[PDB]
Amino acid sequence: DLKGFEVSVMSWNIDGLDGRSLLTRMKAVAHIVKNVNPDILFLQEVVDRDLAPIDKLQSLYKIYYSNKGCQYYTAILVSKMFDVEKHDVIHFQNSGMYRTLQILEGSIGGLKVFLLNTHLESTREHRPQRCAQFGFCMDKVREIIAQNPGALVFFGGDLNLRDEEVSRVPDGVKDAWEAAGSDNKTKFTWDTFKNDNKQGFHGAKMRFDRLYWSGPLDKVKFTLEGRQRIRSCLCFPSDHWAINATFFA
Ligand SMILES: [Mg+2]
Numbered sequence: 001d002l003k004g005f006e007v008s009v010m011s012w013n014i015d016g017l018d019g020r021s022l023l024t025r026m027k028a029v030a031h032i033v034k035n036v037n038p039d040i041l042f043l044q045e046v047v048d049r050d051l052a053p054i055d056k057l058q059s060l061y062k063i064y065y066s067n068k069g070c071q072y073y074t075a076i077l078v079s080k081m082f083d084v085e086k087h088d089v090i091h092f093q094n095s096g097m098y099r100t101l102q103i104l105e106g107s108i109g110g111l112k113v114f115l116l117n118t119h120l121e122s123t124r125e126h127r128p129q130r131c132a133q134f135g136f137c138m139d140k141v142r143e144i145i146a147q148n149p150g151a152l153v154f155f156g157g158d159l160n161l162r163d164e165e166v167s168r169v170p171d172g173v174k175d176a177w178e179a180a181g182s183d184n185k186t187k188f189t190w191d192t193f194k195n196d197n198k199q200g201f202h203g204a205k206m207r208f209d210r211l212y213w214s215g216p217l218d219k220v221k222f223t224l225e226g227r228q229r230i231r232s233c234l235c236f237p238s239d240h241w242a243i244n245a246t247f248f249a
Pocket of ligand 1: 016018045
């Protein structure tokens with residue numbers, strides 16, 4: 001049965017586009033990953049420069065990059081026990097920012113698993129593109145679910161959402177943070193009040209980073225990670241907190 005079955009999914013925009021203290025920050029990212037030790041890890045805004053500390057995680061994970069060599073891209077890292085069946089990268093047709101829906105399909109044990117990682121169009125101005133992408137992603141999730149009854153499906157990443165932007169979420173698909181209890185202490189994943197990696201914002205807080213799921217696991221625990229300043233350079237690993245969700249029966 002699925003009782004005692006448990007899988008953890010972590011997602012993090014690692015702010016690779018910010019060149020300041022990039023190597024130290026990527027080392028910190030890899031450090032935090034090894035300590036949280038998630039089964040599955042989604043990354044966004046990964047860059048080629050100073051990727052080594054991340055790439056070195058291949059001793060612990062299989063690493064799939066959405067579009068390596070592009071200005072920035074996403075990654076999905078899975079346990080070496082994850083049996084990969086397909087890796088598909090869908091380029092959003094309406095994107096001016098090389099954004100993609102990265103899909104890794106496989107299984108761990110006997111359980112079919114679909115992993116969908118994205119970084120939706122950025123900024124208030126691109127609401128049109130972003131809302132269309134989200135809808136498109138949900139349609140894809142709806143289809144995967146229909147085609148694979150009994151599968152675990154995880155969809156998320158940096159969705160850049162304001163709540164009023166969330167559209168057609170299928171019944172059966174739940175938001176991990178909400179299902180864990182809509183805890184205020186774990187709500188905002190991009191918090192310019194507390195995160196000072198970026199200047200010029202003036203106290204904006206958003207729940208940009210989210211994880212949705214469908215499947216035979218009905219309970220979820222949800223925490224934030226990467227919230228500690230790096231001592232040597234006095235910055236956070238990223239201007240985003242990581243989200244960390246543990247799904248169980
Ligand atoms: Mg950035």
